[PDB]
Design an enzyme around this catalytic site. Sequence first.
Site, PDB file in Angstrom:
ATOM      1  N   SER A  76      44.239  21.750  39.395  1.00  0.00           N
ATOM      2  CA  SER A  76      45.141  22.496  38.346  1.00  0.00           C
ATOM      3  C   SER A  76      46.804  22.490  38.759  1.00  0.00           C
ATOM      4  O   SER A  76      47.673  22.948  38.187  1.00  0.00           O
ATOM      5  CB  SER A  76      44.689  24.028  37.972  1.00  0.00           C
ATOM      6  OG  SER A  76      43.498  23.682  37.273  1.00  0.00           O
ATOM      7  N   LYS A 115      49.336  21.344  36.970  1.00  0.00           N
ATOM      8  CA  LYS A 115      49.887  21.984  35.956  1.00  0.00           C
ATOM      9  C   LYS A 115      51.143  22.365  35.983  1.00  0.00           C
ATOM     10  O   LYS A 115      52.103  22.897  35.447  1.00  0.00           O
ATOM     11  CB  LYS A 115      48.958  23.233  35.411  1.00  0.00           C
ATOM     12  CG  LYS A 115      47.436  22.867  34.899  1.00  0.00           C
ATOM     13  CD  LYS A 115      46.575  23.989  34.589  1.00  0.00           C
ATOM     14  CE  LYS A 115      45.416  23.660  33.998  1.00  0.00           C
ATOM     15  NZ  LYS A 115      44.551  22.871  34.770  1.00  0.00           N
ATOM     16  N   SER A 155      45.319  28.687  33.968  1.00  0.00           N
ATOM     17  CA  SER A 155      44.819  27.442  33.920  1.00  0.00           C
ATOM     18  C   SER A 155      44.140  26.605  32.949  1.00  0.00           C
ATOM     19  O   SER A 155      43.195  26.023  33.447  1.00  0.00           O
ATOM     20  CB  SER A 155      44.056  27.411  35.539  1.00  0.00           C
ATOM     21  OG  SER A 155      44.260  26.280  36.088  1.00  0.00           O
TER      22      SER A 155
END
Length: 340
Positions: free
Chosen positions: A41, A44, A92
């Site tokens: 993640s 991101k 997330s």
Amino acid sequence: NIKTMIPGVPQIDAESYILIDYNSGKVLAEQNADVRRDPASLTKMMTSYVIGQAMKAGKFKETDLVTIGNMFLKPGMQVPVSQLIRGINLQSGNDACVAMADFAAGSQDAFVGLMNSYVNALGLKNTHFQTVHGLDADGQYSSARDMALIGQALIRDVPNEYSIYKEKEFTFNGIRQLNRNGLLWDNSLNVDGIKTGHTDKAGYNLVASATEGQMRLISAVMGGRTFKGREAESKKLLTWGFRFFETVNPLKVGKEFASEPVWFGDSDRASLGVDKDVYLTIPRGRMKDLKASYVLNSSELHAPLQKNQVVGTINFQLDGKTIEQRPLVVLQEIPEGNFF
């Protein structure tokens, strides 16, 4: 030899890590910082970087609504951009990434193309994204250094987007969601970023940033062993970085650092400084021993002298050794001298 020592690094329970200073880019500690890993993640961050640039550019507001197809979002749901970017940064949420990707670029492939365009724009040599959320992909990778630099870009280029990373909670559909960056709750540090992540192939990853005074550090840990260790190891690095290093701002723009004589000019002396502000990361406590000198590119200065004209180099010395160099420039221009 207490002043001139090189500190030992703590043992970090992760495969890769790096610690840098936000202002000067100095690397204080690293281990396998360039090994290509699965980013999880942490991807991101780049997704948030693309989004931050668009809003900064004015393409869409934080109040705009996004319709879903096709956080537990459902088709036909109308969700403000404000809530989806928080679903990405704090929670997330992989579904929030997909929604924002179709909304910002029209498709996930078009959005991954932008992510990888900024990768090159930042000069990252060990990063390639195949997804908008960071799930394990055969062709996508990153590294501790590149992720520490992506976080730097977030703070530098889109500070409005970055301010979201310190929010402890947000509410979506009547449900309070906590930010997964548990370091925000740490009383010993001032942590306002950045992003957690984890997958089976990536382990436990964390990119964190803290401040002590005007000093800001960025740590990236990848391949962490445990969920709790994710934050503990990053806290090790940040506290260690602040205990043994200090960032100093010796000269800023406009401050006269030296004067040299000028021939044939409207004035007889030039005021020399820097055009870009100087940030130096040094062992803490050694600012009193920091010495600065300079050399000139020319035996004489002749008018006209243009503003921000390079005429030499500044050398910052610590223990008789040059540690950093910056161009010496003319601050105020000096036109040609005239005779009646």
